[PDB]
Structure 1
Amino acid sequence: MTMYIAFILSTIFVIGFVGFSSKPSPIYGGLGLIVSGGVGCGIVLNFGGSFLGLMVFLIYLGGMLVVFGYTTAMATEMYPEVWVSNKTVFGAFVSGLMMEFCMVYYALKEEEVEIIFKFNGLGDWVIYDTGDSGFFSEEAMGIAALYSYGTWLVIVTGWSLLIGVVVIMEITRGN
């Protein structure tokens, strides 16, 4: 739907999110969230976070899960899981479709969905503003300020990563 395109983007984000959170095989679970990872990028891309959308592809989508799928390769269960192997995973999946299709329909209704928070599930296109960005890109300028305004943020991130590499080797060598 053109008007609510991000809503379709958002809905696809959760159905894949439910699928892999339903504890399927790690390879299958990888598929469930990478499509969720890709579709979530479109949501950020549609809002204007060009770098943030493209960057989650490179370190999370093409990053995180490649070494993650690497780990499931050496796990190599003799009985790899398929969605039909257990009925619990199907029960979660048909559930994940159930309440999702439930309250989006209730969202399609008078629009007073009030689970936990108060939500007005109107068309997502309304929330934007009418202010131009001139020449500077708002997202690009913000991240570029890491080296001018992010003085403490960069130091702890750099320090922790150096701690990160030493701790990884310290706990994998096995004394």
Structure 2
Amino acid sequence: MMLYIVFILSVIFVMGFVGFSSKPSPIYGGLGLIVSGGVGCGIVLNFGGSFLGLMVFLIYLGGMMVVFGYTTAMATEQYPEIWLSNKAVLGAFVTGLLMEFFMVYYVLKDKEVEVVFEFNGLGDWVIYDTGDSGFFSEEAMGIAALYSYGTWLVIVTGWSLLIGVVVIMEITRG
């Protein structure tokens, strides 16, 4: 059951998505986007994405905090909706979860499922790299290279953020 960690985490990843995609109050929607973002670290972490896993988690953590601040200010209501207090949200939540359960049951039972496209259920471990042994994480080398190689990416991203600050000033100040 430990050889299927990456599958179990992915299942929770989807379950978290159905939580906020059915769209309850943004308070619980953000909660489901925190769980998906944390097990998103888990999936990326098992593949060797230690830095990448923690960066999406850390970035999405501060992102939802601002969304919680904004929800109380602008997207609230006397009776915040949860997944069990609205026929439309409960329908979306149940429709999503059942759709996932049938995927999990079939892929596990038959070691393969064909939800439109063929997927192989032997386990995610079958594809990993067998060999490696260097004093470094190839992930960090790639990210660290952003400054010696990706000069062009640095400029367009850095410029976009600077224009991003000017943009939000103009938009809000009317």
| Structure 2 SS opposite 1:109 | helix
Equivalent residue, structure 1, for 2:80: 80
Equivalent residue, structure 2, for 1:41: 41
User: What is the deviation of 1:114?
Assistant: 2.3
What CA distance in whole angstroms lies between the structure 1 residues aligned with 2:106 and 2:86? 31
User: What is the deviation of 1:112?
Assistant: 4.0
| Structure 1 SS opposite 2:93 | helix
User: What is the deviation of 1:162?
Assistant: 0.7
What CA distance in whole angstroms lies between the structure 1 residues aligned with 2:170 and 2:70? 19
Mapped pair 1:156 → 2:156: yes
Alignment of 1:90-105 (within 5 A): 90-105=90-105
Equivalent residue, structure 1, for 2:14: 14
Alignment of 1:140-151 (within 5 A): 140-151=140-151
User: What is the deviation of 1:130?
Assistant: 1.4
User: What is the deviation of 1:35?
Assistant: 0.7
Would you identify which runs of 4 or more consecutive aligned residues in structure 1 move more than 4 Å? none
User: What is the deviation of 1:25?
Assistant: 0.7
User: What is the deviation of 1:94?
Assistant: 1.5
Moved more, 131-140 or 30-39: 131-140
Aligned in 2, Cα 1:8/1:82: closer, same or farther, shift over 3 Å? same
Aligned in 2, Cα 1:81/1:110: closer, same or farther, shift over 3 Å? closer
User: What is the deviation of 1:155?
Assistant: 0.5
What runs of 5+ residues in structure 2 fail to find an aligned partner? none
Moved more, 111-120 or 40-49: 111-120
What runs of 5+ residues in structure 1 fail to find an aligned partner? none
Q: Percent identity over the alignment?
A: 83
Describe the superposition over 1:64-114 as per-residue Cα deviations: whole angstroms up to 9, x where unpaired.
111111110102322322223211111111211211110221112334422
What CA distance in whole angstroms lies between the structure 2 residues aligned with 1:7 and 1:172? 43
What CA distance in whole angstroms lies between the structure 1 residues aligned with 2:81 and 2:67? 17
Equivalent residue, structure 2, for 1:106: 106
TM-score normalized by the length of structure 2:
0.94
| Structure 1 SS opposite 2:113 | coil
What CA distance in whole angstroms lies between the structure 1 residues aligned with 2:92 and 2:77? 22
| Structure 2 SS opposite 1:83 | coil
Equivalent residue, structure 2, for 1:69: 68
| Structure 2 SS opposite 1:78 | coil
RMSD: 1.3
Letter in 1 for 2:92: A
What CA distance in whole angstroms lies between the structure 1 residues aligned with 2:14 and 2:8? 10
Moved more, 52-61 or 112-121: 112-121
Moved more, 73-82 or 14-23: 73-82
Equivalent residue, structure 2, for 1:171: 171
Moved more, 85-94 or 143-152: 85-94
